[PDB]
């Protein structure tokens, strides 16, 4: 879609639908590559799309399990992470056009956010009332654990400062945590 | 023993003849396994491709004989794999479906074909996930008895099941990460 | 909080037999060797009869409320 | 040559090779990251 904006007055329309991409199956997540126009959609299969192509350019998939959410990298933008309904986190790299790693978790993970200041670090919003901080290279363990919610964490976001993280949960509260401290400093 | 003796079909196929020479060769080489191999006889052969690109030898066998085949299917199957490499050897029974055949009978025969396929391994369970969009993902959960061998064969099982039953399935093995 | 789709492996073993995701028996059979004739006999873990070696007519196990207690000297293996 | 392994087994090895490459190339960012951690003061933008 296209929207007219008033940032600049250097001109003066065509506001509305620009292009539509039809899919065989339902889509449940979308994110865009930062440098280039390519964007990835998470449906029954994780698909890599190009703006100037109506059909999916590349088909990524480790297996038959669906993908619930996905988030492109900001620093090493060729890398992608996705979340599956089989309680799994999948890593991808576009330079190889193939998946790289999975770790199967006890509970489902609803959202991910990658640290803007550390390219190899990311946090995951999890269903066990916890949010987990991970290192890309060695995923056998987590960097940190955030455990101050009482219901499932639905979304998580890194600050552009990279030092602070906010988590949304189903318990009607927003908790915001320091990256090196395992307990929330504030409740909204 | 002539290869045609091993073939129940009056008109043996060339592939079927080849598997018959293989089987009688195993009879001759074997000192005492022949006593079990000789009575065993198969109805026919079907060679079916896989998404992996290999093929699978589906040997149609009678059920009362299929019991004896199951007694000896490990040794026989590895040997047939050696003689025909890049082709997955699987024994499946031929069991009647005609009363047009009934749909309940077809579900039943499909599921027996499934257990006979997964042999030597056994089915732990069956799972079906229903997607938000409406897609259905069907998965069969297998035991880890012969995890390595079937892990080298899951796709072949899948292709044979789609070819015979016309259903899309995914075979997964709990207790490890594939 | 737990995931009924993917319970931990230890969880089902601790849980009652009928209450699991897919219920199944917790019993098993045994290959018990007769002390007298060294022959092997199949015996149910919760076997409810005083299973006797057919060759020796020797008691191999005795019934109890739960698992049948294997007779003294009778070696066994899980089958 | 050798008989081709099944695609998932072949591709599992392909994924593992890819993950090793992904690790080395993200590791290039380590040097600046430790500098940011050790920096007394960060003035945004860096």
């Amino acid at each position: 879609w296209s929207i007219n904006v008033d940032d600049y007055s250097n001109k003066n329309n065509e506001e509305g639908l620009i292009r539509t991409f039809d899919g065989e199956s339902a889509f449940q997540g979308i994110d865009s590559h930062r440098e280039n126009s390519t964007f990835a959609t998470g449906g029954a299969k994780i698909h890599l799309w190009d703006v100037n192509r109506l059909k999916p350019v590349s088909d990524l998939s480790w297996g038959a399990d669906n993908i619930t959410s996905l988030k492109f990298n900001q620093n090493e933008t060729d890398i992608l992470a996705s979340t599956g309904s089989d309680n799994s986190i999948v890593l991808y790299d576009l330079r190889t056009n193939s998946p790289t790693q999975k770790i199967v978790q006890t509970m489902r993970t609803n959202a991910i956010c990658w640290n803007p200041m550390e390219a190899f670090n990311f946090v995951t919003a999890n269903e066990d009332h916890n949010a987990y901080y991970y290192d890309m290279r060695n995923l056998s363990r987590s960097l940190n654990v955030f455990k101050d919610h009482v219901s499932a964490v639905m979304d998580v976001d890194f600050s552009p400062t990279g030092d602070e993280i906010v988590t949304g949960s189903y318990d009607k509260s927003i908790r915001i945590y320091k990256t090196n401290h395992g307990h929330s400093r504030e409740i909204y | 023993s002539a290869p045609q003796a091993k073939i129940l079909s009056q008109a043996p196929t060339e592939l079927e003849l080849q598997v018959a020479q293989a089987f009688v060769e195993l009879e001759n080489s074997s000192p005492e396994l022949k006593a079990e191999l000789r009575p065993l006889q198969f109805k026919s052969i079907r060679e079916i491709d896989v998404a992996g690109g290999k093929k699978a030898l589906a040997i149609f066998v009678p059920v009362p004989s299929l019991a004896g085949f199951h007694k000896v299917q490990t040794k026989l199957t590895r040997e047939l794999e050696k003689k025909f490499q890049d082709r997955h050897v699987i024994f499946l029974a031929e069991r009647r479906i005609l009363p047009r055949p009934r749909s309940r009978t077809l579900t039943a025969v499909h599921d027996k074909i499934l257990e006979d396929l997964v042999f030597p391994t056994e089915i732990v369970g069956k799972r079906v996930r229903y997607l938000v969009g409406g897609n259905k993902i069907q998965k069969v959960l297998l035991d880890s008895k012969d995890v390595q061998q079937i892990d080298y064969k899951l796709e072949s099982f899948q292709a044979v099941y789609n070819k015979l039953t016309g259903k899309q399935i995914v075979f997964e093995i709990p207790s490890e990460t594939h | 909080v737990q995931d009924l789709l993917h319970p931990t492996a230890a969880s089902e073993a601790r849980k009652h037999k009928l209450k699991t995701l897919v219920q199944g028996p917790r019993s098993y059979f045994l290959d018990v060797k007769c002390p007298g004739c060294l022959n092997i006999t199949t015996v149910f873990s919760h076997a409810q009869t005083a299973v006797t070696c057919e060759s020796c007519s020797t008691i191999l196990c005795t019934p109890t409320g739960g698992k049948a207690k294997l007779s003294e000297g009778t070696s066994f293996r899980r089958k | 040559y050798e008989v081709p392994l099944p695609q998932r087994i072949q591709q599992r090895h392909d994924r593992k090779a890819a993950y090793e490459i992904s690790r080395q190339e993200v590791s290039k960012w380590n040097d600046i990251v430790q500098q940011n951690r050790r920096a007394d003061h960060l003035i945004f933008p860096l």
């Binding site: 790693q101 199967v104 987590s142 | 990460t177 | - | 994924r15």
Partner: peptide, 27 residues
């Protein structure tokens, strides 16, 4: 803690590793 008094072989499970079930690529 009550169980720890008797059963000999218990691995202490790190809080950072309890919530992982398995990894495809071991290292």
């Amino acid at each position: 803690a009550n169980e720890r008094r008797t059963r000999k072989d218990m691995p202490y499970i790190s809080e950072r590793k309890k919530q992982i079930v398995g990894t495809v690529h071991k290292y």
